Swiss-Prot record, chain A:
It comes from Xenopus laevis (African clawed frog). Coiled coil: none annotated. It is found in: Nucleus membrane; Nucleus, Nuclear pore complex. This is Nuclear pore complex protein Nup93. It comes from the Eukaryota. Plays a role in the nuclear pore complex (NPC) assembly and/or maintenance. Disulfide bonds: none annotated. Belongs to the nucleoporin interacting component (NIC) family.
């Protein structure tokens, strides 16, 4: 689920800043859902900036 | 004013960063210039300031 998320996120990033923001928001939501979740969320946020 | 935020973000001018900072410090639309400068960071690989 997280991979599909980040893939759609890149699709939207590739309108740009908003796309990346929504991506990081989705990451943080899925993170709080399940720390490896949160670690992956923040690390992806840092990997996309 | 013209709301062409992208081209502004593309401007490679040495006055860009400080002007954005001064605007976000003195204007009443702190949100506007703040978000703008954050994006301006995210573009130039300037991660931490973003």
């Amino acid at each position: 689920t997280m991979n599909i998320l980040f893939t759609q996120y890149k699709r939207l990033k590739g309108v740009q800043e908003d796309k990346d923001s929504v991506l990081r928001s989705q990451a943080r939501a899925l993170i709080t859902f399940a720390g490896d979740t949160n670690a992956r969320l923040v690390q992806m946020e840092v990997l996309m900036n | 004013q013209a709301d062409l935020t992208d081209k502004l973000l593309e401007l490679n001018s040495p006055f860009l960063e400080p002007h954005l900072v001064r605007m976000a410090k003195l204007d009443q639309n702190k949100v506007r210039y703040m978000d703008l400068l954050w994006r301006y960071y995210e573009k130039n690989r300037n991660f931490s300031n973003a």
